[PDB]
Amino acid sequence: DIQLTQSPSSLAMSGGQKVTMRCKSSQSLLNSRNERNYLAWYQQKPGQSPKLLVYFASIRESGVPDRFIGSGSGTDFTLTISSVQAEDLADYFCLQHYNTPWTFGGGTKLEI
Amino acid sequence: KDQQSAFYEILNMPNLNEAQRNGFIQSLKDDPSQSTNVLLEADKWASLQN
Amino acid sequence: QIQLVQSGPELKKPGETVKISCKASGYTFTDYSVHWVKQVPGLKWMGWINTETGEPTYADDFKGRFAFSLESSASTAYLEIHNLTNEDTATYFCALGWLHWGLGTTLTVS
Protein backbone atom coordinates (compact mmCIF):
# COMPACT_ATOMS: atom_id res chain seq x y z
CA ASP A 1 0.00 0.00 0.00
CA ILE A 2 1.01 3.62 -0.59
CA GLN A 3 1.01 5.73 2.58
CA LEU A 4 0.35 9.48 2.66
CA THR A 5 1.92 11.60 5.41
CA GLN A 6 0.63 15.17 5.30
CA SER A 7 2.14 18.22 7.04
CA PRO A 8 0.51 19.65 10.25
CA SER A 9 -3.10 19.06 11.23
CA SER A 10 -3.77 22.70 12.15
CA LEU A 11 -2.55 26.13 11.05
CA ALA A 12 -3.12 29.61 12.46
CA MET A 13 -3.55 32.29 9.80
CA SER A 14 -3.21 36.07 9.75
CA GLY A 15 -5.29 37.43 6.87
CA GLY A 16 -3.17 37.87 3.74
CA GLN A 17 -0.08 35.87 4.68
CA LYS A 18 1.14 32.79 2.82
CA VAL A 19 0.42 29.24 4.02
CA THR A 20 2.14 26.07 2.78
CA MET A 21 1.03 22.48 3.40
CA ARG A 22 2.99 19.39 2.42
CA CYS A 23 2.10 15.84 1.36
CA LYS A 24 4.73 13.08 1.27
CA SER A 25 3.99 9.63 -0.16
CA SER A 26 5.88 6.44 0.65
CA GLN A 27 6.24 5.65 -3.07
CA SER A 28 6.30 7.70 -6.25
CA LEU A 29 2.96 8.77 -7.72
CA LEU A 30 4.42 9.57 -11.16
CA ASN A 31 2.88 7.45 -13.92
CA SER A 32 5.34 6.57 -16.68
CA ARG A 33 2.56 6.45 -19.29
CA ASN A 34 1.38 10.08 -19.16
CA GLU A 35 4.09 11.61 -16.91
CA ARG A 36 1.41 12.78 -14.46
CA ASN A 37 1.64 12.60 -10.66
CA TYR A 38 -1.60 10.95 -9.52
CA LEU A 39 -2.27 13.24 -6.56
CA ALA A 40 -5.11 15.70 -5.98
CA TRP A 41 -5.77 18.41 -3.40
CA TYR A 42 -9.23 18.99 -1.91
CA GLN A 43 -10.87 21.67 0.22
CA GLN A 44 -13.74 20.68 2.53
CA LYS A 45 -15.82 23.11 4.59
CA PRO A 46 -17.95 21.97 7.55
CA GLY A 47 -21.06 20.11 6.45
CA GLN A 48 -20.06 20.23 2.77
CA SER A 49 -18.53 17.86 0.25
CA PRO A 50 -14.84 18.08 -0.69
CA LYS A 51 -14.09 20.38 -3.63
CA LEU A 52 -11.29 19.69 -6.11
CA LEU A 53 -8.64 22.42 -5.98
CA VAL A 54 -5.65 20.89 -7.80
CA TYR A 55 -5.41 17.67 -9.81
CA PHE A 56 -2.38 15.93 -11.32
CA ALA A 57 -0.16 17.39 -8.57
CA SER A 58 0.18 20.89 -10.05
CA ILE A 59 -2.76 21.55 -12.42
CA ARG A 60 -5.36 23.93 -11.02
CA GLU A 61 -8.99 22.93 -11.46
CA SER A 62 -11.36 25.22 -13.36
CA GLY A 63 -13.01 27.80 -11.13
CA VAL A 64 -10.35 27.65 -8.40
CA PRO A 65 -8.65 30.98 -7.61
CA ASP A 66 -5.06 31.21 -8.79
CA ARG A 67 -3.85 31.69 -5.21
CA PHE A 68 -4.14 27.92 -4.68
CA ILE A 69 -0.90 26.55 -6.16
CA GLY A 70 0.05 22.87 -6.08
CA SER A 71 3.54 21.68 -6.90
CA GLY A 72 5.95 18.80 -6.45
CA SER A 73 6.67 15.49 -8.12
CA GLY A 74 7.49 11.92 -7.19
CA THR A 75 6.98 11.72 -3.43
CA ASP A 76 7.11 15.35 -2.21
CA PHE A 77 4.06 17.50 -2.98
CA THR A 78 2.89 20.86 -1.62
CA LEU A 79 -0.23 23.01 -1.82
CA THR A 80 0.41 26.75 -1.47
CA ILE A 81 -2.00 29.59 -0.73
CA SER A 82 -0.24 32.80 -1.75
CA SER A 83 -2.56 35.14 0.18
CA VAL A 84 -4.91 33.34 2.57
CA GLN A 85 -8.34 34.97 2.66
CA ALA A 86 -11.25 34.72 5.08
CA GLU A 87 -13.26 32.39 2.81
CA ASP A 88 -10.41 29.84 2.84
CA LEU A 89 -11.10 28.71 6.43
CA ALA A 90 -11.65 24.99 5.83
CA ASP A 91 -10.01 21.56 5.92
CA TYR A 92 -7.48 20.56 3.26
CA PHE A 93 -6.16 17.10 2.42
CA CYS A 94 -4.25 15.35 -0.36
CA LEU A 95 -5.29 12.17 -2.15
CA GLN A 96 -3.18 9.68 -4.11
CA HIS A 97 -4.85 7.64 -6.85
CA TYR A 98 -1.85 5.83 -8.30
CA ASN A 99 -2.56 2.34 -6.94
CA THR A 100 -5.79 0.54 -6.11
CA PRO A 101 -5.73 1.14 -2.30
CA TRP A 102 -6.36 4.88 -2.36
CA THR A 103 -5.11 6.68 0.74
CA PHE A 104 -5.79 10.16 2.09
CA GLY A 105 -3.69 12.67 3.97
CA GLY A 106 -4.34 13.37 7.62
CA GLY A 107 -6.07 16.66 6.86
CA THR A 108 -5.12 20.29 7.45
CA LYS A 109 -7.39 22.61 9.44
CA LEU A 110 -7.03 26.30 8.57
CA GLU A 111 -8.16 28.62 11.37
CA ILE A 112 -7.31 32.04 12.80
CA LYS B 1 6.38 18.97 -34.62
CA ASP B 2 5.04 18.92 -31.06
CA GLN B 3 1.38 18.80 -32.12
CA GLN B 4 2.05 15.67 -34.19
CA SER B 5 3.34 14.00 -31.02
CA ALA B 6 0.03 14.77 -29.30
CA PHE B 7 -1.73 13.39 -32.37
CA TYR B 8 0.27 10.18 -31.89
CA GLU B 9 -0.48 9.91 -28.16
CA ILE B 10 -4.21 10.63 -28.38
CA LEU B 11 -4.64 8.41 -31.44
CA ASN B 12 -2.82 5.60 -29.58
CA MET B 13 -4.59 5.98 -26.23
CA PRO B 14 -5.31 2.37 -25.16
CA ASN B 15 -8.88 2.50 -23.83
CA LEU B 16 -10.26 5.92 -24.76
CA ASN B 17 -13.88 6.41 -25.76
CA GLU B 18 -14.00 6.37 -29.55
CA ALA B 19 -16.37 9.34 -29.70
CA GLN B 20 -14.21 11.24 -27.21
CA ARG B 21 -11.09 10.24 -29.16
CA ASN B 22 -12.53 11.68 -32.37
CA GLY B 23 -13.30 14.85 -30.43
CA PHE B 24 -9.75 15.18 -29.15
CA ILE B 25 -8.35 14.60 -32.64
CA GLN B 26 -10.88 16.94 -34.27
CA SER B 27 -9.97 19.63 -31.73
CA LEU B 28 -6.34 19.02 -32.71
CA LYS B 29 -7.36 19.54 -36.36
CA ASP B 30 -9.42 22.71 -35.91
CA ASP B 31 -6.70 24.38 -33.83
CA PRO B 32 -3.25 22.74 -33.87
CA SER B 33 -2.53 24.97 -30.88
CA GLN B 34 -3.80 24.02 -27.40
CA SER B 35 -1.98 20.72 -27.96
CA THR B 36 -1.20 20.52 -24.23
CA ASN B 37 -4.81 21.26 -23.25
CA VAL B 38 -6.28 18.41 -25.30
CA LEU B 39 -3.61 15.98 -24.07
CA LEU B 40 -4.52 17.14 -20.56
CA GLU B 41 -8.18 16.28 -21.14
CA ALA B 42 -7.17 12.89 -22.55
CA ASP B 43 -4.97 12.06 -19.55
CA LYS B 44 -7.62 13.42 -17.17
CA TRP B 45 -10.41 11.14 -18.40
CA ALA B 46 -8.14 8.14 -19.02
CA SER B 47 -7.17 8.24 -15.33
CA LEU B 48 -10.89 7.98 -14.49
CA GLN B 49 -11.54 5.20 -17.02
CA ASN B 50 -12.80 1.82 -15.82
CA GLN C 1 -22.19 20.06 -15.40
CA ILE C 2 -21.06 16.91 -13.60
CA GLN C 3 -23.36 16.33 -10.63
CA LEU C 4 -23.73 13.56 -8.04
CA VAL C 5 -26.70 13.44 -5.65
CA GLN C 6 -27.00 10.97 -2.77
CA SER C 7 -29.91 9.82 -0.64
CA GLY C 8 -30.95 11.62 2.51
CA PRO C 9 -29.71 11.09 6.06
CA GLU C 10 -30.34 7.77 7.78
CA LEU C 11 -31.13 6.86 11.40
CA LYS C 12 -30.63 3.14 12.04
CA LYS C 13 -30.55 0.82 15.06
CA PRO C 14 -27.59 -1.58 15.37
CA GLY C 15 -27.89 -4.80 13.39
CA GLU C 16 -30.09 -3.33 10.64
CA THR C 17 -29.26 -2.74 6.97
CA VAL C 18 -29.01 0.59 5.15
CA LYS C 19 -28.84 1.25 1.40
CA ILE C 20 -27.40 4.52 0.05
CA SER C 21 -28.06 5.63 -3.54
CA CYS C 22 -26.08 8.04 -5.71
CA LYS C 23 -27.67 9.50 -8.86
CA ALA C 24 -25.35 10.90 -11.53
CA SER C 25 -25.68 13.23 -14.51
CA GLY C 26 -23.53 15.26 -16.87
CA TYR C 27 -21.19 12.59 -18.23
CA THR C 28 -21.06 9.11 -19.74
CA PHE C 29 -21.81 7.03 -16.65
CA THR C 30 -20.50 3.72 -18.01
CA ASP C 31 -16.99 4.94 -18.91
CA TYR C 32 -15.73 6.21 -15.53
CA SER C 33 -15.71 4.34 -12.23
CA VAL C 34 -17.63 5.31 -9.09
CA HIS C 35 -15.73 5.21 -5.79
CA TRP C 36 -17.05 5.16 -2.22
CA VAL C 37 -15.38 7.08 0.62
CA LYS C 38 -16.10 6.98 4.37
CA GLN C 39 -15.59 10.05 6.58
CA VAL C 40 -15.81 9.48 10.34
CA PRO C 41 -17.20 12.56 12.19
CA GLY C 42 -10.26 11.44 8.62
CA LEU C 43 -11.00 9.87 5.23
CA LYS C 44 -10.90 6.14 4.46
CA TRP C 45 -11.31 4.83 0.92
CA MET C 46 -13.87 2.02 0.75
CA GLY C 47 -13.59 0.82 -2.85
CA TRP C 48 -14.90 1.31 -6.36
CA ILE C 49 -17.30 -0.33 -8.80
CA ASN C 50 -16.83 -0.82 -12.53
CA THR C 51 -19.62 1.14 -14.20
CA GLU C 52 -19.45 -0.85 -17.44
CA THR C 53 -19.46 -4.40 -16.03
CA GLY C 54 -20.80 -3.83 -12.51
CA GLU C 55 -17.86 -5.62 -10.89
CA PRO C 56 -17.05 -4.12 -7.47
CA THR C 57 -13.62 -4.04 -5.85
CA TYR C 58 -13.55 -3.52 -2.09
CA ALA C 59 -10.77 -2.39 0.21
CA ASP C 60 -9.40 -4.81 2.79
CA ASP C 61 -11.34 -3.10 5.60
CA PHE C 62 -14.63 -3.31 3.66
CA LYS C 63 -14.75 -6.90 2.38
CA GLY C 64 -17.45 -8.31 4.66
CA ARG C 65 -20.64 -6.33 5.17
CA PHE C 66 -20.35 -3.98 2.17
CA ALA C 67 -21.75 -4.42 -1.34
CA PHE C 68 -21.62 -2.14 -4.39
CA SER C 69 -24.31 -2.33 -7.07
CA LEU C 70 -25.64 -0.31 -10.01
CA GLU C 71 -28.83 0.54 -11.87
CA SER C 72 -27.39 1.57 -15.23
CA SER C 73 -30.78 2.60 -16.64
CA ALA C 74 -30.90 5.39 -14.03
CA SER C 75 -27.15 6.15 -13.72
CA THR C 76 -27.28 5.35 -10.01
CA ALA C 77 -24.71 3.59 -7.83
CA TYR C 78 -25.65 1.87 -4.57
CA LEU C 79 -23.88 1.21 -1.27
CA GLU C 80 -25.30 -1.45 1.06
CA ILE C 81 -24.03 -1.95 4.61
CA HIS C 82 -25.26 -4.98 6.55
CA ASN C 83 -25.16 -5.61 10.32
CA LEU C 84 -24.65 -1.96 11.19
CA THR C 85 -22.42 -1.15 14.17
CA ASN C 86 -21.41 2.03 15.97
CA GLU C 87 -18.22 2.48 13.92
CA ASP C 88 -20.29 2.60 10.70
CA THR C 89 -21.69 5.96 11.86
CA ALA C 90 -20.06 8.32 9.35
CA THR C 91 -20.64 10.36 6.20
CA TYR C 92 -20.42 8.27 3.03
CA PHE C 93 -19.40 9.84 -0.29
CA CYS C 94 -19.78 8.57 -3.84
CA ALA C 95 -17.11 10.09 -6.08
CA LEU C 96 -16.59 10.16 -9.84
CA GLY C 97 -13.03 8.99 -9.32
CA TRP C 98 -10.87 11.83 -8.05
CA LEU C 99 -12.72 14.47 -10.08
CA HIS C 100 -16.14 15.13 -8.51
CA TRP C 101 -17.43 14.14 -5.06
CA GLY C 102 -21.01 13.43 -4.11
CA LEU C 103 -22.86 15.61 -1.64
CA GLY C 104 -22.60 12.94 1.04
CA THR C 105 -24.94 10.89 3.23
CA THR C 106 -24.80 10.99 7.03
CA LEU C 107 -25.54 7.64 8.70
CA THR C 108 -26.13 7.48 12.46
CA VAL C 109 -26.30 4.13 14.27
CA SER C 110 -27.76 4.19 17.78
Side-chain angles (χ1 to χ4, degrees):
Chain A
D1 301 15
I2 297 180
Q3 180 140 9
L4 278 188
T5 308
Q6 213 161 273
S7 210
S9 60
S10 184
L11 278 167
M13 57 154 268
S14 176
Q17 277 179 319
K18 187 177 76 169
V19 159
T20 294
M21 57 192 70
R22 175 192 207 258
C23 185
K24 174 179 278 177
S25 66
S26 68
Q27 295 172 39
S28 175
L29 306 178
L30 180 62
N31 183 12
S32 61
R33 257 65 186 182
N34 47 20
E35 302 182 316
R36 314 286 188 180
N37 294 273
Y38 281 49
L39 181 100
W41 289 96
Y42 301 85
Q43 176 200 82
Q44 184 182 196
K45 304 191 172 184
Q48 293 177 17
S49 61
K51 305 298 176 68
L52 179 63
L53 297 178
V54 177
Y55 72 92
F56 280 154
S58 61
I59 295 171
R60 185 163 38 253
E61 167 71 6
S62 180
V64 177
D66 46 3
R67 64 175 176 273
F68 293 91
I69 305 166
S71 62
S73 189
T75 60
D76 284 74
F77 305 90
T78 52
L79 175 61
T80 305
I81 309 179
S82 293
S83 186
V84 179
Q85 297 180 353
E87 65 177 351
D88 296 339
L89 293 162
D91 275 310
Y92 299 80
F93 44 78
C94 50
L95 158 68
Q96 71 90 12
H97 49 103
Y98 186 85
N99 271 334
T100 284
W102 290 9
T103 47
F104 290 94
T108 296
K109 181 161 294 187
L110 223 65
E111 60 191 344
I112 312 172
Chain B
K1 39 192 66 181
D2 188 319
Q3 170 251 316
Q4 302 190 3
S5 313
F7 200 96
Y8 189 82
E9 300 305 320
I10 287 178
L11 180 61
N12 296 311
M13 206 78 56
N15 280 335
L16 246 190
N17 180 306
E18 307 304 320
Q20 201 187 35
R21 183 193 311 275
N22 178 259
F24 291 149
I25 283 170
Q26 194 60 39
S27 194
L28 270 184
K29 293 191 193 292
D30 296 343
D31 191 6
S33 172
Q34 285 193 343
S35 166
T36 38
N37 288 3
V38 184
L39 263 180
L40 181 48
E41 280 285 287
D43 294 353
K44 166 183 177 182
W45 295 106
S47 65
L48 307 165
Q49 197 95 21
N50 285 310
Chain C
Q1 276 283 336
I2 295 170
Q3 277 271 308
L4 306 174
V5 160
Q6 297 182 209
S7 58
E10 292 285 356
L11 289 164
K12 296 295 177 185
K13 294 186 168 64
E16 296 178 335
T17 297
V18 66
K19 185 172 195 180
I20 297 174
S21 55
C22 168
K23 202 177 207 302
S25 80
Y27 66 97
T28 291
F29 183 75
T30 48
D31 284 346
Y32 312 114
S33 305
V34 177
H35 298 239
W36 289 96
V37 182
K38 168 183 179 180
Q39 183 176 253
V40 178
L43 279 183
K44 198 161 69 174
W45 183 79
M46 299 175 59
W48 63 289
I49 175 158
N50 192 290
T51 45
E52 177 188 24
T53 70
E55 176 194 8
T57 297
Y58 308 85
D60 290 334
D61 301 327
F62 297 89
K63 270 187 165 57
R65 307 169 289 112
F66 301 87
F68 302 145
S69 54
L70 299 177
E71 192 159 353
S72 300
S73 56
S75 305
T76 303
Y78 294 99
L79 162 66
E80 269 199 319
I81 314 176
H82 307 277
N83 192 357
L84 287 164
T85 60
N86 283 15
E87 59 249 69
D88 288 313
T89 293
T91 301
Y92 292 95
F93 296 98
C94 62
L96 176 54
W98 51 259
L99 179 59
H100 192 92
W101 284 62
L103 303 189
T105 294
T106 58
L107 167 68
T108 302
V109 175
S110 178

